[PDB]
């Protein structure tokens, strides 16, 4: 009872067997149309070979849609795909590599979609990462991608909302002025007097500019660098000029995997075509050739149907600009031994990470205090942000629990206000400080029992790199 549409998959660069076996068990019956797969491998990946393969398959086969993959890092693949889709009025889903790098400002009549995060969702998850340690946004952008103007106007855009606690934006916009004597691009990096620097760029000019950052003194010890997906998304290789870890978001590191991605795209195309045959009772008749053009209005209806797809548990819908809505994201670190080791987790609002403290941070102090009346006041956190605006402290309180697991220095960072905290915030700028502020647990402040001391003096006698500010006579 279901008829057929023609779906061609193209892989450039391996195991066409794992991709074949994964989908050919997906039974698209129980749907109104069923697919027709056709594998085709290629290795040239030049524009002329791409067009002369794509419209060759269009001329031979009644092709409904194309699922394109890649194993390169050339972004300009995607525009070529974005060129031909509006030329052919047929859907194309770029699912890996350079086809998955995000292209802003797509054409109005294009039907090209990508698996990947938007250019603004990466900034949103970059804010949600920095809301663990109350860091401060200082973004610089040297190159000029088409996805620049959305980035600053999305990163501002939350710093004026509520309960912020965020520092200023000493922003630096540069460009691709071909001028070596313009060394102020080396000289303006002294204006980044900040521990956290955002850098939205390309891979090659970042490989250039991190040598410049080492030349000025933006080393990996006192500063960090949070970097979006398009610079260091190539999980296999790394240039030697990156002692600059905590790179930001990528997708899940092995694309569920690549044949599961192929199966998901096949399900997307067939579900949209089944929805169109269920609602309007006719499918689009396929294109004649890349030569013949004259003898489509229903392609806009296909564009409306392709962006409201849902499968067994995965809302794989799309926005108007060709990216996913929900999708799974990971967080990567860089491994001074030159690997990429971190597998962080982010899902649709939420972030889950490791250790509750950042490793690699002498002027680092632990400081233990005590809650009382108006000297050190402990209050709860905001239910929308976690951090504290005017209170400006973690106060990482430990939980005493059952005696089979350790304590909780990941218990939620209760805000502390009051007199001694306002004194400490002046003494920090007075000499040079860094807090690790936490509360006592045994609740035995200022006591000496037979043999020993407890409480704040108990954590003084145990040599735990301490001060004891608070109410203490």
């Amino acid at each position: 009872s279901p008829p057929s549409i023609g779906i061609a998959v193209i892989l450039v660069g391996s195991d066409e067997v794992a991709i074949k076996d994964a989908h050919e068990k997906d039974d698209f019956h129980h749907l109104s149309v069923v697919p027709r797969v056709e594998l085709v491998a290629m290795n040239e990946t030049d524009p002329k070979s791409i067009i002369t393969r794509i419209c060759d398959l269009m001329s031979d086969r009644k092709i409904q849609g194309v699922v394109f993959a890649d194993d390169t890092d050339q972004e300009a693949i995607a525009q070529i795909l974005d060129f031909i889709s509006a030329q052919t009025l047929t859907p194309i889903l770029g699912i890996h590599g350079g086809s998955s790098m995000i292209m802003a400002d797509k054409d109005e009549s294009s039907m090209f979609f990508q698996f990947g995060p938007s250019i603004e969702q990466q900034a949103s998850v970059m804010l949600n990462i920095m809301e663990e340690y109350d860091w401060y946004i200082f973004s610089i952008v040297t190159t000029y991608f088409p996805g620049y103007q959305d980035f600053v106007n999305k990163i501002r855009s939350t710093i004026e909302n509520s309960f912020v606690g965020w520092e200023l934006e000493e922003v630096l916009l540069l460009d691709m002025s071909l001028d070596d004597g313009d060394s102020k691009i080396q000289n303006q990096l002294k204006k980044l007097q900040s521990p956290i620097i955002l850098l939205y760029c390309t891979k090659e000019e970042a490989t250039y500019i991190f040598e410049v950052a080492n030349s000025v003194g933006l080393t990996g010890y006192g500063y960090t660098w949070i970097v979006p997906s398009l610079v260091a998304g190539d999980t296999d290789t790394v240039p030697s000029e990156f002692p600059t870890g905590l790179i930001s978001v990528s997708y899940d590191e092995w694309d569920y995997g690549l044949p599961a991605r192929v199966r998901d795209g096949i399900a997307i195309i067939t579900t949209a075509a089944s929805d169109m045959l269920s609602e309007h009772s006719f499918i689009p008749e396929p294109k004649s050739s890349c030569y013949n053009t004259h003898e489509i209005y229903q392609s806009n209806m296909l564009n409306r149907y392709l962006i409201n797809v849902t499968f067994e548990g995965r809302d794989l819908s799309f926005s108007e600009d060709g990216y996913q809505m929900h999708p799974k994201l990971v967080i990567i670190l860089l491994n001074k031994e030159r690997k990429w080791e971190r597998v962080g987790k982010w899902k649709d609002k939420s972030l889950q990470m490791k250790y509750y403290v950042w490793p690699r941070m002498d002027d680092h102090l632990s400081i233990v205090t005590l809650e009382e009346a108006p000297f050190v006041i402990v209050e709860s956190v905001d239910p929308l942000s976690g951090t504290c605006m005017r209170n400006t402290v973690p106060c990482q309180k430990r939980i005493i629990s059952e005696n089979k697991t350790d304590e909780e220095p990941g218990y939620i960072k209760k805000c502390c206000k009051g007199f001694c905290i306002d004194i400490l915030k002046k003494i920090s700028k007075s000499v040079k400080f860094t807090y690790d502020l936490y509360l006592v647990t045994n609740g035995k402040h200022g006591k000496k029992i037979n043999g020993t001391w407890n409480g704040m003096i108990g954590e003084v006698v145990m040599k735990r790199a301490y001060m004891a500010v608070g109410s203490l006579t």
Partner: antibody
Amino acid sequence: VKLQESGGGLVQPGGSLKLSCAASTFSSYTMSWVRQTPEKRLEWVAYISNGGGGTYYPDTVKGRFTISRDNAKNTLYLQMNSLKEDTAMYYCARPSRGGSSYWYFDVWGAGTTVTV
Amino acid sequence: DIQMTQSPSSLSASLGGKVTITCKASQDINKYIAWYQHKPGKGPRLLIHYTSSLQPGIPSRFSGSGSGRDYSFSISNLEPEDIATYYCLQYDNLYTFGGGTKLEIK
């Protein structure tokens, strides 16, 4: 991988005979099988996908037939009811290139008969 | 579902003659063709793909032409180990079949 049929008979005229064809990868492979006329015509009997769905017939044997498959034992299951005027031979055929779609098999079975 | 009807009823030819059988469906097939041959009681043997693409192990004795929904398939230079019966397949809806013919030798 090879296909071998079993469950051959029409011992009741107008009865029901659940025939099968085992295989020795067949789990991603759909199924549709064949009876033969006295004019030897390879008329279709039923249709399953690889995943059990898509249960259909042509217009010859509609209305009487109960259909299933098991990709673990690599077998088909369908009871023959309206072959009661034929001395048919049935074989199993596993269409190439798998899927819930269909392509051209050379992967057919061995061929056994059903006689009334 | 769409149903097919092949025609007609005979492959009456001598040793090395020429016969042709037509795939004729009720709907447009877009050259969706296959071809099989078998003895009574032995089992089919594949011949023909989309562009009459023959099979390794099958000789060049079998050719054909046609389009859209109507196709012709010609057999010549036949050695009589191929005492068989030739069959056409369509798969627009799930699968499709017609009558087909049997081979006799005069």
